[PDB]
Amino acid sequence: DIVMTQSPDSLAVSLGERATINCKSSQSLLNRGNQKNYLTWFQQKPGQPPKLLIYWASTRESGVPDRFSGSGSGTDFTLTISSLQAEDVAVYYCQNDYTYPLTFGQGTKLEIKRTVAAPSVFIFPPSDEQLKSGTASVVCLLNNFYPREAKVQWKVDNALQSGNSQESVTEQDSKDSTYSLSSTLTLSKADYEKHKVYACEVTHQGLSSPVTKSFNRGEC
Amino acid sequence: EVQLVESGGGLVKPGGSLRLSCAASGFTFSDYGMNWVRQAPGKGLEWIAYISSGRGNIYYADTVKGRFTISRDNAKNSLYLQMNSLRAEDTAVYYCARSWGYFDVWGQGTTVTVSSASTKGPSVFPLAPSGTAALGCLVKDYFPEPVTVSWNSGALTSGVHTFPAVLQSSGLYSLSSVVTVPSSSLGTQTYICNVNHKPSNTKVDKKVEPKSC
Amino acid sequence: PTACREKQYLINSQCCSLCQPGQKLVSDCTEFTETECLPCGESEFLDTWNRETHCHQHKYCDPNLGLRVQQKGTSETDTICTCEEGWHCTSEACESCVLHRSCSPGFGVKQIATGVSDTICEPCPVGFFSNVSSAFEKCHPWTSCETKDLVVQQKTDVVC
């Protein structure tokens, strides 16, 4: 069973610079008959089947932009993406194509480094319909920001929340290279109804000061 | 065209059985080797089965040896995967892929969930609005993945973010889908998120209008 | 006043081009059109600069014989097989897999294996030899000839 170890696991590269993804195999992928190294490269975008990039370690598949250059031989291979573009954000896999079982590398998550973008923050009260079920979901949306690091804080009548929130992120945008974030505070209806002021406090590199979106229960 | 269209995925109880199909079109299916690659959620790609173009040679990954049997029907242009004695590690998206030395055309992907738990349609709740405004839909308490959300039947795509689903203690899935729209188009333009959960054959259309106090 | 290259062959007074390894022949080259070839099938191959009109069927490494794939079948090479971590190929052709070891050139089989005794190998004495690795062959003797031109080692026979 041949083992591909890619390197790095994650990579953050600026727009228009060069990305280098390395791949090493436990065995040689070299066919002595035809002098070809059987190493295939794939690019898998969010919720999409992998798209084939390079085969025989350096042959660019028809259709693939010439920025994508495969190279290497023996046990050490490398994928180079020159003049990186925003649409290049995806996970990249090297595959052993030399024998069965055909084994893939573990993946390399490429992030696009762009300039700093601040989120637009929104808060949403829990609907009256959800309160019959006995729980209250307060959602806070952080829209279109870069880099990932963002800090949501939930306050309920100015008292800091802990443990009752969950954050979830979108995939970096294929056009504008930004993240989006939802923070959902889950409370019981009884506890939601016992307090009045619900607030979302957001900090981000691109902001100057914290941004707080609030609403009062029962007022509006 | 060059297409591969999986079908057959879904929820099944452990030890149960499933048969995925793959509908080839736009090329000479006979000429190609065929494969199944899967991807466990949040994990990598794993090759599991192969069938050759001629004598019909067959190789498997050891992890499906015995239980899964790959087959083809060149006459019906189709690849098949009989999965038997299914374990929880078999939960993944199952990718169809043609090969003539290297994988170059892949299938849609079809999700297979191996679980004792039962299908549940989602509750869709409104994330209502208060230059740009933001509205959305809270799709809650469904099993299994995936739901798919669209807005105005696909006629609204600009600014839509649908976050990934999170599993809760309840053993049920939850996610939010949000869209940014001009605050002017708020009494005029009517917004509806279309939540389609095929595993339970539920379609929910929730209309999100602003709250009047 | 004329020539013929190494990757060409002679047909019908014209020196035509051979098909590259991996491509079969479709029709022969004439005065004014060259040889037309076509790649082999996904399950086929051809080792050589050739003029064959059918490709070869790919080797199947059968698991029921303990066979793994060592190197994939490619257009220009045949599938190579081998065996599990503790096993042996019966021969270089590796048609199936065994646990019993075979004596190497220089040794012959004292005792063919049985039960849970592995094959028993001894070194060939003077003057006997073994030019192959085998699990069954014992040392056969050198030709006791007239004109001894070369002596014999043990794993080669006296050449006279």
Numbering used by the authors:
A (entry chain B): 1 to 220
B (entry chain A): 1 to 130, 137 to 219
C (entry chain U): 23 to 176, 181 to 186
Q: Which of the paper's sentences describe this entry?
A:
Therefore, we determined the crystal structures of ABBV-323 (antagonist) Fab alone and ABBV-323 and FAB516 (agonist) Fabs complexed to the 3 extracellular domains of human CD40 along with in vitro functional assays to better understand the protein interactions that govern agonist and antagonist activity of CD40 mAbs.
The structure of ABBV-323 Fab bound to CD40 exhibits two complexes in the asymmetric unit. Within the asymmetric unit, each complex contains one CD40 monomer associated with the Fab on CRD2. Specifically, CD40 residue K94 inserts into the central cleft of ABBV-323 and specifically binds to a negatively charged region outlined by residues (L)D97 and the backbone carbonyl of (H)G101. Additional epitope interactions are observed for both heavy and light chains: CD40 E64 displays hydrogen bonds to (H)S53/(H)Y50 and CD40 T99 displays a hydrogen bond to (L)N31. When generating symmetry crystallographic equivalents of the CD40/ABBV-323 Fab complex, CD40 is observed as a tight antiparallel homodimer. Not only is ABBV-323 bound to the primary monomer (“monomer 1”), a second monomer (“monomer 2”) of the crystallographic dimer associates with ABBV-323 through the N-terminal end of CD40’s CRD1 which includes the amino acid residues T24-C37. Specifically, a position off of the Fab’s LCDR1, (L)R32 bridges two strands of CD40 CRD1 contacting backbone carbonyls from CD40 (monomer 2) A25/S35 and a potential sidechain interaction with Q36. We therefore conclude that ABBV-323 functions as a CD40 antagonist antibody due to its ability to capture the non-signaling dimeric state of CD40 receptor which sterically masks CD40L recognition.
